[PDB]
């Protein structure tokens, strides 16, 4: 992982994820939506295993984007949890949870769940 | 489980769940919403382990309600997955997924996730 994780990743819809994996387990970078505009950019922060197992196990990781920047506030945050799998066609496989700020009466509709695959290509 | 599962159960919001657990693993019954009207009643069907382990493990179970009856169609279905824990204050602990029928463009907002506890009291 590490230098294999660093770089640009794309999901099946066209979103772009740019990350630097640091030497002691930090992930920092930006998430850019479809349309690809100069801000549908949002800051991301996360963590990964920097000493992963040596058999063929993937590298466990996760990160958060809060959907506020200088142009937009969508009053929500998404966490992605998954693993990096290296080699010839490297990918990152994730499940995600998206939570919106709600009143306590509407709290039953606060969290959506789905899944995403990122490739280098 | 079985005769311990049969009967009336209540969650923290006041919804009422009525189930018969059958001899070979079937669950059949009705779910009634808050307000408690003569139809906010919906049919449920599910399955449970009828030969559970004999140490203190819970009984694994799940069920589905599609939200259509004679008065209302909400074009959605919920599955509850959990376990029954018996004894002095018996409860059923669940996580649930609620999916709405969407177009493929809106398919990112189809499934909500939450959790529920049912007691006899």
């Amino acid at each position: 992982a590490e230098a294999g994780i660093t770089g640009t990743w794309y999901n099946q819809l066209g979103s772009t994820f740019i990350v630097t994996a640091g030497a002691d387990g930090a992930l920092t970078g930006t998430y850019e939506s479809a349309v690809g505009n100069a801000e549908s950019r949002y800051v991301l922060t996360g963590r990964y295993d920097s000493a992963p197992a040596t058999d063929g196990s993937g590298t466990a990781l996760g990160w958060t984007v809060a959907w506020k920047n200088n142009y937009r506030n969508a009053h929500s945050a998404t966490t992605w949890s998954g693993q990096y799998v290296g080699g010839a066609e490297a990918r990152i496989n994730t499940q995600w949870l998206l939570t919106s700020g709600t009143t306590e009466a509407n709290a039953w509709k606060s969290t959506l769940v789905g899944h995403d695959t990122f490739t280098k290509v | 489980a079985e005769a311990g599962i049969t009967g009336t159960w209540y969650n923290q919001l006041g919804s009422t769940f009525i189930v018969t657990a059958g001899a070979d693993g079937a669950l059949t019954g009705t779910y009634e919403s808050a307000v408690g009207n003569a139809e906010s009643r919906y049919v449920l069907t599910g399955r449970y382990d009828s030969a559970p382990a004999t140490d203190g493990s819970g009984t694994a179970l799940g069920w589905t309600v599609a939200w259509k009856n004679n008065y209302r169609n909400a074009h959605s279905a919920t599955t509850w997955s959990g376990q029954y824990v018996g004894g002095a204050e018996a409860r059923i602990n669940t996580q649930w997924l609620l999916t709405s029928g969407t177009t493929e463009a809106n398919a990112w907002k189809s499934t909500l996730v939450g959790h529920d506890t049912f007691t006899k009291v």
């Binding site: 939506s33 349309v35 959907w67 969508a74 | 907002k109």
Partner: peptide, 6 residues
Amino acid sequence: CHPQFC
């Protein structure tokens, strides 16, 4: 449609 999507 949410910024994660559009």
